[PDB]
Symmetry: D2
Subunit: 475 residues, 4 copies
Amino acid sequence: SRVKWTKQLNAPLEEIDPEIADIIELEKARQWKGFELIPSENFTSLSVMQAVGSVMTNKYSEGYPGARYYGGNEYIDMAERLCQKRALEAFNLDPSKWGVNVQSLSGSPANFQVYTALLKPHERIMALDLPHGGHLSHGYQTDTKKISAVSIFFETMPYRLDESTGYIDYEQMEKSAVLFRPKLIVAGASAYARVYDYARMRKVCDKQKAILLADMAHISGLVAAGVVPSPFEYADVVTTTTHKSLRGPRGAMIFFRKGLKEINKKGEEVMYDFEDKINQAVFPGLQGGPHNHTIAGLAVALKQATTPEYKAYQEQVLANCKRFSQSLIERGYSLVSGGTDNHLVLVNLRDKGIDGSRVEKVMELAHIAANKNTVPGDVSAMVPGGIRMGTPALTSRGFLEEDFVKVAELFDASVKLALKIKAASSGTKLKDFVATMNGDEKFQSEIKKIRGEVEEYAKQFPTIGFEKETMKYKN
Amino acid sequence: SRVKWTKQLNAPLEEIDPEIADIIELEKARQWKGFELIPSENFTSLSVMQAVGSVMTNKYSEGYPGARYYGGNEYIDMAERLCQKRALEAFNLDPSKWGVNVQSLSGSPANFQVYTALLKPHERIMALDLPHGGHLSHGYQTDTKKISAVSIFFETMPYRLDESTGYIDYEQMEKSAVLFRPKLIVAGASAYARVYDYARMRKVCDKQKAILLADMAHISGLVAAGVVPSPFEYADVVTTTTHKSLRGPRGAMIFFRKGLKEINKKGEEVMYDFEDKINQAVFPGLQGGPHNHTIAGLAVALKQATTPEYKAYQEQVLANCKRFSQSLIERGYSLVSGGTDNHLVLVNLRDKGIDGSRVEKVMELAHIAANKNTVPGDVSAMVPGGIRMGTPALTSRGFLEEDFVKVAELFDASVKLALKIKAASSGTKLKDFVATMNGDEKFQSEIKKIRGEVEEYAKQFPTIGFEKETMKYKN
Amino acid sequence: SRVKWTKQLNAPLEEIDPEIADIIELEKARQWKGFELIPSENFTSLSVMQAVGSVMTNKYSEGYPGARYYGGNEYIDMAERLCQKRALEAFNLDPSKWGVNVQSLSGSPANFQVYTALLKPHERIMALDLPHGGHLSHGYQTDTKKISAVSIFFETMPYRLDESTGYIDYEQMEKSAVLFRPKLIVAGASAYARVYDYARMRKVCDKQKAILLADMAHISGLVAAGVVPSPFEYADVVTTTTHKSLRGPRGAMIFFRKGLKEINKKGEEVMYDFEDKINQAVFPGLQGGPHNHTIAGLAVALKQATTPEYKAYQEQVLANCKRFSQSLIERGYSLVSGGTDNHLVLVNLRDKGIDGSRVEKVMELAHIAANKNTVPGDVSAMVPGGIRMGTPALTSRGFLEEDFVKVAELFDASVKLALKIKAASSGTKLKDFVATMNGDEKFQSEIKKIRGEVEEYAKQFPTIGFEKETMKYKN
Amino acid sequence: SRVKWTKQLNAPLEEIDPEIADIIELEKARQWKGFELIPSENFTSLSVMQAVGSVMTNKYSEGYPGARYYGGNEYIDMAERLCQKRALEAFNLDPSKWGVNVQSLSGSPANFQVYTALLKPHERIMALDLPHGGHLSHGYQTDTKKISAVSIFFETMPYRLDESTGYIDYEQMEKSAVLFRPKLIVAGASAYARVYDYARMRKVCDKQKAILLADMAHISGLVAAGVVPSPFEYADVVTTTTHKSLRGPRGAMIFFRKGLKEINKKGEEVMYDFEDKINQAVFPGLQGGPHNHTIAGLAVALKQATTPEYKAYQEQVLANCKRFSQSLIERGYSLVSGGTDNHLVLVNLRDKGIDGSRVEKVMELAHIAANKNTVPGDVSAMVPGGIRMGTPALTSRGFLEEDFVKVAELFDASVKLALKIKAASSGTKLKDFVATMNGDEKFQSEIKKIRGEVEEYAKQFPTIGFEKETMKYKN
Ligand SMILES: Cc1ncc(COP(=O)(O)O)c(C=O)c1O
Ligand SMILES: Cc1ncc(COP(=O)(O)O)c(C=O)c1O
Ligand SMILES: Cc1ncc(COP(=O)(O)O)c(C=O)c1O
């Protein structure tokens, strides 16, 4: 019995669980053969994945470096201190001006921890509306329901895009803010094509005596590589995920100002007051022990984020996206805001006579990952009139500009085939669209032709995180 | 720079971050050479670690199987459905009576998601107090501050131990419940060495029209092996972590009743109301994209947890703990509650003339990782009067029983040397103890030879999750 | 002078409203003919009613004396300052240790304003349970619904009587307070025959670092005459109505500590922090303009409360109650707590085989105003087994020594006739009892006899606030 | 001494309390000698004062007519039922579509009871901003502090006037409402010279699924005489004081929709859901026993409100205000909105090169009661730019129109004297203005240049509620 269970523990994945090993091999094939245009998705390095799947997952280390509750954390302390040092180092942060918490398990909980730390329950947040490019962790309630728990435990009011220009309406946000008296404002989007006017946000915030939180989840990589202006120039607190633009493990970081804020009008020192509160909201407030395996992975990701290879990659992300937007517009498409400053494009399909659900379904059965997105001009939010697409994943594969021109041509083909399926559709709901899409074989023929072109094009490019040879699904 | 970054993506961790690779090798040596006594720690299988370190981390899959926001989740859906199937199977649960959520990132958020799903903000919870054996996710407030976030967003009142027996006082709890009118009662603890009376707690909850939440974080593996009564016999909602007794990756699960609750007196049948609320509280309520790599790992952990080797291992952790308790009684130490029914022994060190701090410091010097603890009888919070120690970690490596007697003997040697240092310290606070402990040349000699004995006993057993051979740190 | 109205503004209640003039004359006859035994009732002086009926009602005077919004409040300021001075004088209070707010419109809002001033929303209050003798303005919730709004905006838990003695159970109060951690404890009852142990309440509040609020609405007159221990000996804040035992107009007062709290056995100088908070919670917090007509009336009532006639009256209220309790016990009745220390008695009718509802109905048919009251042993709130009666009202009319012996005799007659009507009832519900009582002529004869005895007795005594000579309904 | 205390209760006010009798006689003289222009003020009839000063104050009657806790309420039930009937009649309301609660003690608590009945704590209210003509009981918070407890227990956001036009900006309210998602919107004002566009606010509330509360405190009289559009045409709930434009005693009423709301177009009848909630929020929720003396007074006021001479008086209030505004404009004053629809004008004194504080001080020393008021465009409040003036009080005394031309002329004289004192003001701060105004016998003798004119003009008019002959201070 005694050595049998020891061998069960050291047996590899292929011997103990063939079905999970096989699901992973299938997913490897799907990542190899597919166009990944979902801008929140990326391919994480083998280095990061080896650290994430290490024995660091075994150690319980409640607390912080040099103030832990459990013993035997000398090496875990080394890893977490190195992670903090490299985090401040990646975004060019003076350690006496800025502090960082790397224990946050993911983006949504990271924001909730900031709100719990800095706000009393029911205090007021403004953030970019979800159907306008905001995240659920900013707050969201419909006409009918509280969707995000941020809206349950705090009072949230959205600020919206200018419907005609597709940029954030800062004139309506400032007016809104004088009336609503928010204690914190979130500068951070998921589905926004442009760069925040952090200077204007800081002005609105210190007039309204408000906290400036930046959610740079979507662009964190870009600001580590200096290709887009750093929110750390103006923000009081910056949160991010570690796994999007930044391309590390699934996790989060909370940066905050520390040290001296200013001298006030009586000559006394005003000290920043976010470190203790954020650190305590994370633990023992809302989390327990940290995930030291993901902290090790994040430390490796942050070392990669400071290299010239990384800077090259993210200026490529930007250039690929500029050329992608040019191709999309020249093919006869409307972008909201009419271009991009970053890693994504939001296509407004309203003028082509089809919405985002039908286009997304056709694109997916052709192995091109996009996601339906609401657009300015949408009457509903349940019926999205747009499609969101991004570069970072395929660019990580080594896609360059010509390659995104081919992907735009295949997207054009997908939209036109989706228009043909809508014309021939035997109904008006989404189920009838999918019915005629899989009840006519002309459309299934053209779907497989598009899929075939996508797979032949994608397979030419390197696999990230594993080697093509030792795969299980080569054909 | 065209293909020059692809190799940086696929390079090994040793050639990527040599400093993190080295820190991991140090921690591997520490796990191999060390007496791991921390009862919330364990050694996870290579199969789990390989799945956690896979490319499953790359996919965004907001939502649930067959109802995701993004497409291309065929394989992620397979993994999550298999995880749910194996979760229900590991605890012998009728899929028509019990449902499971496997997306919860950790234990504290899992409980908070149950509260957010089933209670309005500021509704009332009863739970086991913290300094008697509770967890922070149950709530805690002293005369000064709200520490755990749960006491911020909900109204919490504790139930206490019978101060002479060391079991839960089921009467003071019933009385205080009639007065406090709680909406939910939490059964489950950390530093509590006994198993609960679920039947009486179901009776109290039925009387007070209250929700029975069982937190089985500390005993989850023990419940899956059938060696202790299943809380699923009487509980409405069961939360657990996946990392400790269950021996899987760092995560959590929420189980909830579904289907028929009872038939009301008007003839109508009433259905449970937990599934939709809990699933929505988890996402889109408080979390974002699921961590599919940890879900894959958890699926393989749960498959291991159904096997006879696993049942043998859990009966072994129980037997090792019984022998450890007896071997400590022979030395002459006090166990709080007068013994143990499970995997942990909380030694009551007050009546030996030394605290938890000094013994833990010396044990960490000797590569014997345990943790300071407060028992009923202490003087304050951070002056601890107990040591908590657990079998599951060392038992994972093949510790048998007589091996835990040698562990008890070396712990006795550690506490005796700690007494020798405390009596000879010129001062009375922890600082004078630590000063005199490592400016000695006599006690430092005894510490190095104890550590030598510890390493000699430890290194004999197999390394769990990696091979002894390619350890970059041999001796 | 240049008008089509003014005619109706200076016309008496004459033909301006014959129906209301008539209803007032009816109520005057009812106050003359009847036994008023409801212990919260009293007869107000003519001087108070004349001040309440003055043109002081016309002035808007938001704010406080010398700190008002509007001009022309020099005389209103005189009246409010005089009211405050006489309030502090009527309870023998040093103006440098106590302050008073006389703008609170009634008892329930007065308590709510104290909570709003001193507690954040959802902070914790303890108070005497309503079916055990508490008030709704202290909090009340059933198994299904929040009844009092104090329970909506604050978290309330009750303390109970010892159902064996009939006194407040201070032991279970102290215990449940240790668990519940209240910010404020209310010492105040309605249906309670005994005096508060303010010393023990002070000790509990000092232990829990909690605010002692005494709600002396029922005994304020008794406290003003000094014939009962003063809650100002121990309380942080004292609230009262102005219209019960104190015998003024319908209103309320909030008294609070001001100046030094204690040089404190641990450091700095602590000042009482209640004045500004309470004054601001009253206005501009929860009320608008003060009712200066009611404040003038209250000033007259407080002047009367300092006279020897008034002291005689209150010691008479106490003596009448002692003799009334003796007569009730000598006629075979059970009193809750077995007697009284104050102005009322709770008769426990359970041993006489009849409930409070049937006895109250029969007493009302006889023009004896009392009210059903729950007693220990009562299963539910719907069917009370006791009767509450008190002496302030009829004592105001000059009921002396043996007059409450006649009250006891006529109550005994009502109980015995009620038992006869219960025996002859066809059904078990109160509707069948009332049907028999009005529609069975046997009982009609004895009803007329006791009503006659009641009226012939009451009519002999002086009318309070009007002349018998000018009564539209004199016979 | 039972003959004493009896006599003390029946002694008149002039005998018991000469000091209060004297203060009332002083206030009578002040009501006789002066121009009352504060538009929230009025002179109550002797009829309602005699009912308010009646023995109805003595009866406790918690509950509602036909459902009281205490017996002996047959005549109080008559008065409350008559009050309800006459309330619904005086506003021409179908008793099967509207119900009324007449127990509410005053305006501020009446609104708080509506919020407590119809909203959960922390739910959202929109109301007219306080410096734009709103009331504190609709919510108010500054940069630093929460002023009204409505803003403590509920989440409040204001809507503003158009700063150029002086009408409510209904566009900006609709926009704000989309973003802020209010559960209730308040159509109601205290310093707003126009009638609400109730139809537009019905449209906004129907769009936002929001409750329309009208607060007609200032215009209830005008609505009762039918000389302005009735908010009941559109509101879900109407609140009012009883003591301003309506001219009754100090109290409040809550009207609400009851019965059928609409057919849900699925077949079902949906019923209005206000009556039970509001009635329970008033009692037992936030109040105790009703003030039956005030309810009797209100019944008399409501009977007067249905007479032709009442309609004449309210038509007169309107005509007097039109002529007052015309006189002010022909004398070169700036009125916010350029005129009036109702009983008041808000004069913008900044166009004459002075503020509201200086003009108010000079007017008060001349016995012209007005009040400083924020005009839209003020550089903050604290020093307001306007004076608020109204016609109901002096119109009650019989001021006809030519009389308000004299009022306008004497106000103009007061403003010009204040300008002369500002010219001589050595400094700019208000203390130097008061110093110059008192210490400069040129200005002191011109102040008596009016006051004398004002006093002679006021003395020529009838005293309301008392007799010129029986007055004490007749010289
Ligand atoms: C702007 C922004 N903030 C926060 C998050 C939260 O991410 P997660 O799903 O890891 O919780 C996201 C999503 O990735 C995001 O786009
Ligand atoms: C102790 C106590 N508090 C508060 C109140 C409420 O006073 P009111 O009915 O004037 O609102 C009462 C009623 O008499 C009372 O007895
Ligand atoms: C619009 C409005 N609401 C509420 C109130 C509150 O009145 P009170 O001072 O009687 O509380 C007023 C004042 O008269 C008012 O004008």
